Design a protein around this ligand. Structure first.
Ligand SMILES: Nc1ncnc2c1ncn2[C@@H]1O[C@H](COP(=O)(O)OP(=O)(O)O)[C@@H](O)[C@H]1O
Ligand SMILES: Nc1ncnc2c1ncn2[C@@H]1O[C@H](COP(=O)(O)OP(=O)(O)O)[C@@H](O)[C@H]1O
Ligand SMILES: CC(=O)N[C@@H]1[C@@H](O[C@H](C)C(=O)O)[C@H](O)[C@@H](COP(=O)(O)O)O[C@@H]1O
Ligand SMILES: CC(=O)N[C@H]1[C@@H]2OC[C@@H](O2)[C@@H](O)[C@@H]1O[C@H](C)C(=O)O
Lengths: 363, 363
């Protein structure tokens, strides 16, 4: 019954997820701890997601504040759980993606794991993505293995679907190796648009999206990106799908209401997920939705209707809160590293084969 | 009787040292292998040593080339020694420093250890300084503990003096715990000056230096830099001692012949060493010189003259070739990581205490 911490901080930059798990015969969630991202740090992370000056100095100092916050949250969670650091075997830390360039064969995650070990007094397993990339893979997604271990079922063809900043799906097909790929944007554009407009961080329950009307021509134009055509191992991020990208599409088209664009963005996510998922697993019987997109009532409804042959529900029904799936997954990967068990799925990432993912920074 | 690889590429940027050692009852050098740094790569690393644009993307691509070259070298050495990589327990990789800012509490060594593990098929231990910096230390020097393991003679006092781009000394005073610090510039300015003048990489045997004559006024002004005044834990780099820095001193005084300036730079190194060393260890009886500075005949004689109470010889006289000392140290630090033994020295670095240095990237 070794206990592990998982630290995830996704591209939505909403905040830091910290989970505690017990890894026995099955993965149990013991506790969760959410740290909202400070305004300043969120914006400084966003400033590192595009090319710019003095990045090495800037990232180091952003890194220091990120780790300091992570260690604060870990300390908080342990005290509130009446357990010491000694009772935790290791922290699994994803870090923070500031650049993802699989075409150029690199992915950049910050989160100085040495400093995280020093501050927490706990062994840290981190930097899980770079060995997969080194093995020719996309480096993303890395949860499918975990999704397999949780929800691997012979009797059903399940698709486990994360909807964070970006969407990604794990295809659990009886008989066949685990498949998976980034579907496209999840909340990233819906958040970015309501931020450029107005100045909010996200659209609660997708209520602003539901107030507007879809523009079918715009939808067509957005779906005409090369990434949606591509199949098999692929990944994406803020490099491709961002506000500039959207504005470039809005330029050639005429002027539309802002809510209609938001509605179009919701549909863009629903349709990209639906069509890419159903292309890969037309036999799908259950879509299990995790990540913060699970809480979007407008989005979830649309997925159910665009995939009528499937039962679309969040992972809550199956015992695991959708908020903490990624955090639990990286806790699990620290386990996998310490037992020398493969981290990646080759037919997900496109790597040469299975690889032990991560590096060990001991306390 | 495990075998380790040591990989070191210092601030001189002359090339990559690859050593193979055995760590039985003591450290034995089995083989060495030097890789001249390609011109293109040397200049791109140098371009990352000052603030600039698009550093994260640039550093990543430079990193891949660095690692590709390191892996090539490792392959070449093993084949030439008729060895499988199965027979090597791990590689200790220093990586390549492109920024050293202890004051801002960060230091940046590139060398994607995950890719290095991928390409060599051997477990990599890397990223040694960061944990010392995390512990409130300078992060440099890191060799003193090795120096103590090799040349820890209690009957006699002695200082082990590495002269690379930068000079650093390990003070081995019988009974008293190990101390050390960066003395200042070793070859870095002498290299930088002749490069600026003639394009050459270094001054062979200090012949150019030896053809010129020391200028008193310039020397005084060079010795005036505050770094030389400071005592105890120190570290420095190209951030302080560089050609721009030198030219601030040149401009102040009238024009000098180029060779006289070179003569003066040789004197600057010897005096900053000799005075910092004996200040901290006045009883010094022996100066074991390692690093490429040991090959500078003019420098070695001048060190002898300034320190006549002690013998000044290279480490070759006591078993170890002066070129491979650092490479051997990092292989040793791999051994020290894997046994969970401290690799830093608080009374050298200023860190809160003894720490395991490095991170394990398994093959
Ligand atoms: N009640 C909600 N209604 C709609 N969207 C929501 C709601 N709560 C959270 N979200 C979305 O979930 C996102 C966070 O999802 P998350 O899984 O943390 O993504 P990431 O891992 O990329 O940070 C927010 O940016 C937001 O768009
Ligand atoms: N024959 C020589 N004569 C004088 N200086 C030399 C000679 N060979 C090497 N050097 C000096 O040694 C330096 C390399 O020393 P090294 O120990 O590799 O330092 P670093 O760790 O900074 O790379 C060169 O830059 C040069 O100044
Ligand atoms: C941050 C950094 O890169 N420091 C190095 C450091 O290198 C050696 C390996 C050490 O860690 O002890 C040393 O202080 C000095 C002289 O050694 P070399 O120039 O021969 O490498 O160089 C640089 O300051
Ligand atoms: C490079 C990167 O950070 N990718 C993220 C991102 O956010 C969701 C999706 O794109 C996924 O591929 C991945 O995160 C999850 C945890 C994963 O690796 O499965």
């Amino acid at each position: 019954m070794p206990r592990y911490l998982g630290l995830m901080s996704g591209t939505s930059l909403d905040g830091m997820d910290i989970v505690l798990i017990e890894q026995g015969d099955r993965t149990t969630l013991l506790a969760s701890h959410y740290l909202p991202m400070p305004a300043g740090l969120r914006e400084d992370i966003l400033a590192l997601c595009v090319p710019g000056p003095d990045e090495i100095a800037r990232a180091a100092e952003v890194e220091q504040r990120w780790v300091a916050l992570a260690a604060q949250g870990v300390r908080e969670l342990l005290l509130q759980q009446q357990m010491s650091p000694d009772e935790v075997r290791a922290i699994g830390s994803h870090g923070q993606t500031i650049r993802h360039e699989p075409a150029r064969h690199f992915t950049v995650q910050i989160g100085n794991p040495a400093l995280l070990a020093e501050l927490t007094g706990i062994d840290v397993v981190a930097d899980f993505r770079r060995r997969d990339v080194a093995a020719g893979g996309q480096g993303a997604p890395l949860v499918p293995a975990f999704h397999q271990a949780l929800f691997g079922d012979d009797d059903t063809s399940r698709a486990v679907l994360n909807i964070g900043g970006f969407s990604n799906v794990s295809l659990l097909s009886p008989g066949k190796p685990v498949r998976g790929f980034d579907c496209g944007p999840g909340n990233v554009l819906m958040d970015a648009w309501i931020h450029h407009q107005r100045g909010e961080h996200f659209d609660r329950d997708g209520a602003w999206a539901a107030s507007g009307q879809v523009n079918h021509a715009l939808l067509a134009s957005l779906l005409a990106d090369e990434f949606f055509a591509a199949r098999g191992p692929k990944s994406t991020g803020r490099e491709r799908f961002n506000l500039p990208w959207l504005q470039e599409h809005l330029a050639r088209h005429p002027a539309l209401p802002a809510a209609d664009i938001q509605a179009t963005l919701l549909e863009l996510s629903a349709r990209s997920i639906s069509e890419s998922l159903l292309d890969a697993q037309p036999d799908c019987e259950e879509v299990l939705v995790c990540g913060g997109g699970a809480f979007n009532t407008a989005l979830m409804k649309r997925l159910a209707m665009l995939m009528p042959e499937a039962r679309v529900a969040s992972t809550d029904e199956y015992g695991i809160p959708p908020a903490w799936m990624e955090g639990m997954a990286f806790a699990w990967l620290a386990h996998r590293f310490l037992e020398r068990l493969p981290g990646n799925c080759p037919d997900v990432t496109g790597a040469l084969g299975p690889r032990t993912l991560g590096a060990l920074y001991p306390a």
